[model samples]
Target: EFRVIIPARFDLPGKALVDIAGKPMIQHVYESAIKSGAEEVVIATDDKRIRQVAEDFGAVVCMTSSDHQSGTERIAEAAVALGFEDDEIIVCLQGDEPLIPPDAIRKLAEDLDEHDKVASLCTPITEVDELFNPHSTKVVLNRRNYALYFSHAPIPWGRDTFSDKENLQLNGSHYRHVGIYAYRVGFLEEYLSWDACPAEKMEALEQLRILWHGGRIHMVVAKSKCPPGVDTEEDLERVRAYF
Candidate 1:
């Protein structure tokens, strides 16, 4: 019902082709998408190195420009080039997220049918340390499971539990944003023209632009384990051990 596009860049110190197990990191990400319910999976990149490597593995590659400001924009360009219909879904999954649960990606694309709003996934914060990490990112949801807010800072601080920051524990609802998103083709076109929101600068969470523009994003509680993505040497080694 949907397609998955991975906006890969060589900006990472380790790079998207960083080796994991026997294959490169991006390969693992592509394999995960292929295994998901995505009807097609494509790799969007501006680098020839990625295109060469991806094509060698039979991955569909969409070469994009480096002038784009964000991954969403790169994806928008690719979605249009691919000639998708206005209502088709395009799932954006980060290339570094090798440990992302395939079911989470599948559920994200599949769930798009139930609601008219854009969709993304989340998982309950199981570890107190994870809840406090700004890099982990967080989202607060409304009674109807629509995203209320997203931030790099720990949100909805519990007065009873977080008053003592030194001795904090997650006793209430706390969700870590999965970052993966399923966007309608039309939404991508509109998103391309929308001006950046104020909270986007403060939090660096691009998803804020949608909510600030008075758009709705439905948050689905993923019924699968959502692991931290690769960003540091420690994270790379952790995934290395898994392969």
Candidate 2:
């Protein structure tokens, strides 16, 4: 079951929620997920407003609890209700991403099927500027191609005593972790069983749960750079300009 879920929240940020580019952000994410080769695509939302918006977009919607600590938790509940077996793959695409690539989702789904322990993707590291941008999540991969760490800080701090000239080369060596996440249905369902780790809480990265629990998450470096998604009003405008 390659099920794709978008955990949508109806938080009206600064009174600009309803007027967000003439549609809800979740609808953009859902539309992309449905095109991602998922056998079933569901919008897991806690707010009725968001649910209605999703329905208006003609997307399948499911109600979930507002108490969920993170998107993954809500997705886990949705997967269970959908009756996915242990080996089934469930992908969690952020509800804010309007420009997410269907091909990337498909690749992650296939990878999850091929490797059950594997649970995430790291887009091909390119450009020194991208690696250093704190907004662009940085991830280091081991020789086995599994994630060593995911951070908002610049990674692999070059031990070289070189100036910006040499730093460029060093930064070019690492990759950024794309926010895409795929997990075995059983593993996702059982993630809540373990207590939260300090890193997960401190860094505010729920995926740290996998590493905290001693599970290996294989990181498939995407061949192409992922496009930007909705983050600000400017971002929305830019995407609309594309259409």
Candidate 3:
């Protein structure tokens, strides 16, 4: 029902080309997207070496500008260059998530049918440390599964103070927003042009750009658990065990 775009760079300080399970990391991600039921999956990158390796594996690779600061920014250029229709749905998956489930990827692409501009997955947080940690972004959802707000701080703050002297209970009500996003090309084209809203700037959360413009982001709880993305060498070694 949708296309998958991966904004891959050789320089995540060169993790894309690093060997993992006899193949480069990008290949693992490309294979996952291929199996996710996407109509097509394209690797968008500015590096020729990346394009060569991606093409060698029989993957579709689109060349994008090198100046882009973020993956979503790279996606915006590729989406237009690929001649994507404005109404078509695009699922933007990160290159670093080699362990991402194909089912989760397919779910967001399929969910775009019921959703309008944007949609994403979330999973319930059940730990005391995760709830208090500002590193984890929490989302508050409306009755219809529309996102009301996203914050670094827990949404239900007063309740956190009452769990026994500022000790927050790790109830099932809280959800952590998955970094993956599905969007209609209509919104994707205009997203980068808009000025960063105050809330977006405050939390350094890019998704706030949509909510600030009176947009509704449809949120659904993921049936499968999504593993944390790779960031450090320890994380990289941890993910290699899965391969």
Candidate 4:
């Protein structure tokens, strides 16, 4: 049975209790995880405010260390505390993605089971603005759809057109990495054991450590385009508009 874990904390821009569609942002993510057919769902958080809000909304909550450097580390600590089996899969859905699809959550879990490795979701980069936006992380994939690299910069560079940033043409395939991830409990432990890698530290993207350590990440294109998550109050407003 797969369990869904949503890592949340206090210091995020705006509060986790911020309302969206009549519910807290974390609550929206919790409801979607439940609808996705997860055996269980838990919110791992470092703050009591987030924990209390999540519990009030009928979520299981786990308290994690504030010292955690990444959501992956926070979830790993939660899994260990919860006593999950070594090979049981843990699906981590970032708390900010309130509009994440239920089907996409289910697909990620299924893909992890089928591929028997760490797996994540991605979506096509259709807009020129999103393609160039540093906030929108881009990824390159191999023929089989395994992630080769992920970056904040526009990838595959479009060398010829890149010089004309304003009139740049979309010349190559581009994909945006969805923050959702699924990992076996054992791999989660292994992940914590390693020191941060160069690419991971440089880009501030933890997933790069998997590649640096010679691990493979299976990437699945999302069933539908995912809405952007709350990074600032402005982003929150955009999601609020969706509801």
Candidate 5:
């Protein structure tokens, strides 16, 4: 049975209890996780309010340590605490990304089963603005669909855009990394031991830790566009408009 774990924190605008449509943000995410065909869906959080709210909405809650530096670490802790088998595949769904496609979540789980270590989703970057935005992480992949590198800065540098930021046409497909990921419980254990690597620290991306440790991450292009997660107040308003 594939399991999906969503890591949540109550630090943002309305905390994790922010309203999306008529329900809380975490609830929206949880509902999607359940629809993703996962045998089990869990919400991992350290905040009592978040736990209470999630539990109230009928979500399986795992109280994780607030000290976890990243969601990956938090899920690793939860996996161990729940006694999940080393071979079981676990999908990490970001709590703020309430609009994540359930089909994409299922795709990651299926893709992970074929891969040895990890699998993640990416989508073609259509706008040059988003491509250059530091918040939108860019990923370059090899012919085998294995990620070669991920960076915050625009990569596979359009030397053509170097001189002219505007009116520069990108030649090839530039992909933006999606936050969703799937990993074997065994690799999650190994991930906990490695310290943050230079690339990870530089880009502030947790996935780089795997690359630094000489691990392979199979990246599949997402079936649909996954909207950006809520971070600031502006993001919240945009999401509210969608609902």
Candidate 6:
């Protein structure tokens, strides 16, 4: 059985505010995961307030260290505390992604069978303007759909005309890495022991740590784009409007 885990923080966006549709963003993500066939969904966070909110929603909550530098580490620790075996698979769903597609989660879980190493979801950036959006994390992959590198900058630099059609062809294989991740238990044990990678430091993306350790990450393009995840006050307003 697979467990879906949410790594959240106690902050403005995640606080008591419900969207214009009259629902909390976390609630949306929780229900989506549940609909995706998760045996159980757990929220691993350090804040007591967040824990209280999670429990109020009738979801299991687990306390983790605030000192943990990244959500991956927290999830790893949570797995240990929960006594998950080395063969079990755990899905890390980014809490901020409220509009997360259920198909994405299901696709990622299914893609795991294609590659035994690491598997995650991606979405094709069909728009030219969105290439510069920092939040749209880009990824280049091998022919097998295994990821080679991840970057915030517009990767696969266009050496020719910046035409939409041409960019689309050259960038045909490029994709934006969805915030979601699924990991097998054995790799998580080895992942916890490795030193942080320099590229990860430069990129400030924790997922690079897995690639630095020479693990494979398979990619499955999501069926649709996910919805807006809140960050700042303006984002909250935007998400409200989206509802």
**For candidate 1, what is the lDDT?**
0.85
> lDDT (0-100) at residue 35 of candidate 1?
87
Identify the runs in model 2 with alpha carbons over 4 angstroms from their true place.
12-23, 161-167, 170-172, 231-243
The sequence of per-residue lDDT tens digits that candidate 5 reaches over residues 1-243 is 799999887876555788877898899899989999999999988888988999887889999987874788779888988889999999998887888889999999999887558999988887888888887789999999999999988887876665687777665578888878998899887888888888788788888988898988999888787887777777788889985
Model 1 stretches with alpha carbons more than 4 Å out? 164-172
Query: 2 or 6, which is superior by TM-score?
Result: 6
**Candidate 4 C-alpha lDDT tens digits along 196-226:** 8887988988899999988999998887868
lDDT of 1 by residue, 1-243 (tens): 889999987774647899989898899899989888789999999888999999999999999988974888778888878998998989999887876788889888878876755899888886777878877888999998899999877787776877676777566489988768988888887887889978898888899999999998998898877777787888788788875
Can you rank all candidates by lDDT, best first? 5, 4, 1, 3, 6, 2
The TM-score of candidate 6 is: 0.88
- Quantify all predictions' global Cα lDDT against the true fold: 0.85, 0.72, 0.82, 0.85, 0.86, 0.76
Which parts of model 5 are misplaced by more than 4 Å?
A: 170-172
Tens digits of lDDT, candidate 3, 1-243: 689999887763787777787888889888888999889999999899999999999999989887886788888898998889998889988787776778988888778776447888788887766767776778988998889998979766654364563455566678888777899898876787777888888898889988888778888788877765665676678677876
For 1-243, candidate 6 gives per-residue lDDT tens digits of: 788888876656455334536666677778788888887788888888777877898988788998874778778878888888887888888777676788778778777855656788777876765666775678988888889889988776665645554445434645777778888867777888888889999888788988888877888877787654665666578777774
Position 97, candidate 2: lDDT: 67
